[PDB]
Write a protein that binds this DNA or RNA. Structure first.
Ligand code: ZN
Length: 66
DNA sequence: CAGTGATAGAGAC
DNA sequence: GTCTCTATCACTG
């Protein structure tokens, strides 16, 4: 079990990010963090990966329910 | 239960 | 005062 950590540490092949709320994918099958998957897919052009950070800003949450 | 697409908000200068 | 990037939500099988 354990998986080599995550056998092939889910590491953004685009920005090395290891921490992320969810993992995205690309029609090529390469693993990507949510930011690159969201930004890369929406922009379609290379991006200064220098924007990435090891800290993620926590936003609020629409407390659904009743 | 998990993942995707779409929209909106906040921060900095 | 304005722009941008990123995260979360809702929905479905
Ligand atoms: Zn990434």
């Amino acid at each position: 079990m354990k998986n080599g950590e995550q056998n092939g540490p889910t590491t953004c092949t685009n920005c090395f990010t290891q921490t992320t709320p969810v993992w995205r994918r690309n029609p090529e099958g390469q693993p990507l963090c949510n930011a690159c998957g969201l930004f890369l897919k929406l922009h379609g052009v290379v991006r200064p990966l220098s924007l990435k950070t090891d800290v993620i800003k926590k936003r609020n949450r629409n407390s659904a329910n009743s």
